Amino acid sequence: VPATRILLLVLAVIIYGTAGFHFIEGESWTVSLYWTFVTIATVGYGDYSPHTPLGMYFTCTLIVLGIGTFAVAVQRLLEFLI
Amino acid sequence: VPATRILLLVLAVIIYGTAGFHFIEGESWTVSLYWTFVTIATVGYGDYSPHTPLGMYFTCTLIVLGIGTFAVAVQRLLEFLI
Amino acid sequence: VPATRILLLVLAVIIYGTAGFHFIEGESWTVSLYWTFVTIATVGYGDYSPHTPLGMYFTCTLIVLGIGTFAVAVQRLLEFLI
Amino acid sequence: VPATRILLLVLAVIIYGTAGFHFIEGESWTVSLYWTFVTIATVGYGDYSPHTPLGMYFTCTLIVLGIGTFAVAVQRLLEFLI
Ligand SMILES: [K+]
Ligand SMILES: [K+]
Ligand SMILES: [K+]
Ligand SMILES: [K+]
Numbered sequence: 001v002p003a004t005r006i007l008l009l010v011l012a013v014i015i016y017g018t019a020g021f022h023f024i025e026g027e028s029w030t031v032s033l034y035w036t037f038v039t040i041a042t043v044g045y046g047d048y049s050p051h052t053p054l055g056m057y058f059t060c061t062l063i064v065l066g067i068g069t070f071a072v073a074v075q076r077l078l079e080f081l082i
Numbered sequence: 083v084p085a086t087r088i089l090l091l092v093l094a095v096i097i098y099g100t101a102g103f104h105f106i107e108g109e110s111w112t113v114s115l116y117w118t119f120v121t122i123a124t125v126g127y128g129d130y131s132p133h134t135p136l137g138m139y140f141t142c143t144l145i146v147l148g149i150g151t152f153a154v155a156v157q158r159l160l161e162f163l164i
Numbered sequence: 165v166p167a168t169r170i171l172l173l174v175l176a177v178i179i180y181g182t183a184g185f186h187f188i189e190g191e192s193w194t195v196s197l198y199w200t201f202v203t204i205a206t207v208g209y210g211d212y213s214p215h216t217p218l219g220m221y222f223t224c225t226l227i228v229l230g231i232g233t234f235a236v237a238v239q240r241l242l243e244f245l246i
Numbered sequence: 247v248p249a250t251r252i253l254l255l256v257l258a259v260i261i262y263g264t265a266g267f268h269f270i271e272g273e274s275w276t277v278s279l280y281w282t283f284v285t286i287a288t289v290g291y292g293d294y295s296p297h298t299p300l301g302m303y304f305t306c307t308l309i310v311l312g313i314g315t316f317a318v319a320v321q322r323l324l325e326f327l328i
Pocket of ligand 2: 042043044124125126206207208288289290
């Protein structure tokens with residue numbers, strides 16, 4: 001898969017995660033973007049997390065759709081930095 | 083290993099994690115399912131965690147049985163989405 | 165590397181992590197073992213963490229020595245379960 | 247990529263993470279180094295995390311630049327220990 005396509009896929013995941021957390025959990029756009037990265041990178045500080053059943057369901061979908069995508073994206077970035 | 087078999091294996095892990103956390107730690111089915119995903123994806127927010135010695139032992143078993151299974155499942159899902 | 169040797173290596177990591185956390189941070193053997201798994205699996209709930217400078221240094225060493233070892237161990241366990 | 251070059255790359259990431267967290271979030275050099283390892287290893291206890299918008303942005307950059315680098319570094323260390 002071409003690296004630029006992988007870039008677009010991870011950007012789509014990031015938009016999905018950010019907008020979802022913002023609207024479902026009510027955190028700022030900035031906090032939601034931060035939380036999205038922390039989640040899909042699997043860092044998961046827990047400073048932010050879903051507190052609603054919908055937020056929890058949404059988070060599981062983001063986990064499934066985002067973690068693999070982010071992992072592949074970082075791998076490709078390695079090559080272009082190294 | 084066929085992707086559908088990997089699907090069944092991760093579903094079995096999810097049932098195991100969810101039922102175990104629910105019965106050992108006493109959280110709702112929904113919270114337990116959420117916690118199971120957060121754990122096997124290695125996100126681990128820490129908003130939920132075991133507070134009993136049995137829960138701690140159980141969590142270690144879920145970690146060992148689930149993390150690899152989930153990792154393989156997300157990899158295969160990548161291919162079917164991309 | 166033979167799977168049984170990988171088993172011994174991860175067991176050595178587990179002993180190292182458990183004894184270290186117990187003596188440096190003062191948590192029970194059970195809690196320390198649980199924390200060791202949660203850490204080397206990279207789950208990191210944060211329900212337990214080092215609160216001393218020595219504990220922090222020790223945790224970084226466990227992270228470096230343990231995360232790779234655990235990752236290889238789970239991969240090999242996959243094959244023997246599947 | 248030569249293992250020594252990978253060593254230098256992860257050391258550069260560690261300096262970047264430590265100095266950044268120290269200056270942006272105001273934690274001690276020791277705490278900042280610890281947080282850097284916990285973050286790039288993806289452990290993310292959440293005992294420490296950014297509380298400013300700049301810190302959050304910085305953390306996302308560290309996540310993107312550091313997680314892959316650390317993953318490759320631990321893999322190479324495995325070979326030299328085993
Ligand atoms: K956490
Ligand atoms: K984590
Ligand atoms: K975590
Ligand atoms: K992780």
